[PDB]
Amino acid sequence: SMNPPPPETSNPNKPKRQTNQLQYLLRVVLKTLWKHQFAWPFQQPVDAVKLNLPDYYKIIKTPMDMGTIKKRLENNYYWNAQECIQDFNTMFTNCYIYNKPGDDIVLMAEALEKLFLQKINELPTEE
Ligand SMILES: Cc1ccc(CN(C)c2cc(C)nc3ncnn23)cc1
């Protein structure tokens, strides 16, 4: 029933880059999903205590959220775009694992994920 530590957003010994793909992931992909009407549930780690979801972190062992992704991108935590893309996919997947088809939160995830997919479809070539 307790919350875990959040995912890491800082690790000074992890090597870092700011690729044109990673910039796109911040300026286009994150910005698009962040501003969306359905962004709010996904803008920070799931608070299992406040939300009374005592089994959340029994089920979800790789938590992820856009608050975490936003800090990662802004703090240049990644080496490549695929790390970040995986973070987004992990976020959507967790929601689908924990919840049921047609739940409100699932329809929100789905709307954000459709947009995610449309933006990632135009990820620029690595320059
Ligand atoms: C429509 C809706 C439904 C549930 C919540 C609670 N909350 C912030 C989240 C957020 C996320 C991302 N997954 C969740 N799985 C169950 N609750 N929950 C917020 C909004």
Your description of this structure?
The protein has 127 residues and is mainly alpha-helical. The chain has a single domain (19-123), classed as Histone Acetyltransferase, Chain A (Up-down Bundle), CATH 1.20.920.10. It is 50% helix and 0% strand. The protein has 5 helices and no strands. The protein has helices at residues 20-34, 56-59, 66-74, 81-98, 104-120. Helix 1 (20-34) packs antiparallel against helix 3 and helix 4 packs antiparallel against helix 5 (104-120). It is globular, with a radius of gyration of 15 Å. The protein starts with 19 loop residues before the first helix and ends in a 7-residue tail after the last helix. Ligand 25K binds at residues 41-42, 46, 51, 53, 95, 98-99, 104-105. It is classed as transcription/transcription inhibitor. Keywords: BRD4, CAP, hunk1, mcap, Mitotic chromosome associated protein, BRD, Small molecule inhibitor, Structural Genomics COnsortium, SGC, TRANSCRIPTION-TRANSCRIPTION inhibitor complex.
Blueprint (SSEs and pairs):
Elements: H1 20-34, H2 56-59, H3 66-74, H4 81-98, H5 104-120
Helix pairs in contact: 1-3, 1-5, 3-4, 4-5
This protein binds ligand 25K.
Summarize the structure.
The protein is mainly α and 127 residues long. It has 5 helices and no strands. Ligand 25K binds next to helix 4 and helix 5.
Number of domains: 1
Q: Which shape, going by the Cα principal axes?
A: globular
Q: How big is the Rg?
A: 15 Å
CATH superfamily, by name, is: Bromodomain-like
Q: What are the distinct ligands in this entry?
A: ligand 25K
- The computed structural class is mainly alpha
Secondary-structure element pattern, one letter each: HHHHH
Terminal-residue CA separation: 46 Å
Helix content: 40-55%
**Can you identify the CATH class?**
Mainly Alpha
Main β-sheet description = none
CATH level-3 fold name:
Histone Acetyltransferase, Chain A
- Going by CATH, the architecture would be Up-down Bundle
Q: How many strands appear in the DSSP assignment?
A: 0
Subcellular location: Nucleus; Chromosome
Family: Belongs to the BET family.
Cross-link (Glycyl lysine isopeptide (Lys-Gly) (interchain with G-Cter in SUMO2)): 58
Site (Acetylated histone binding): 99
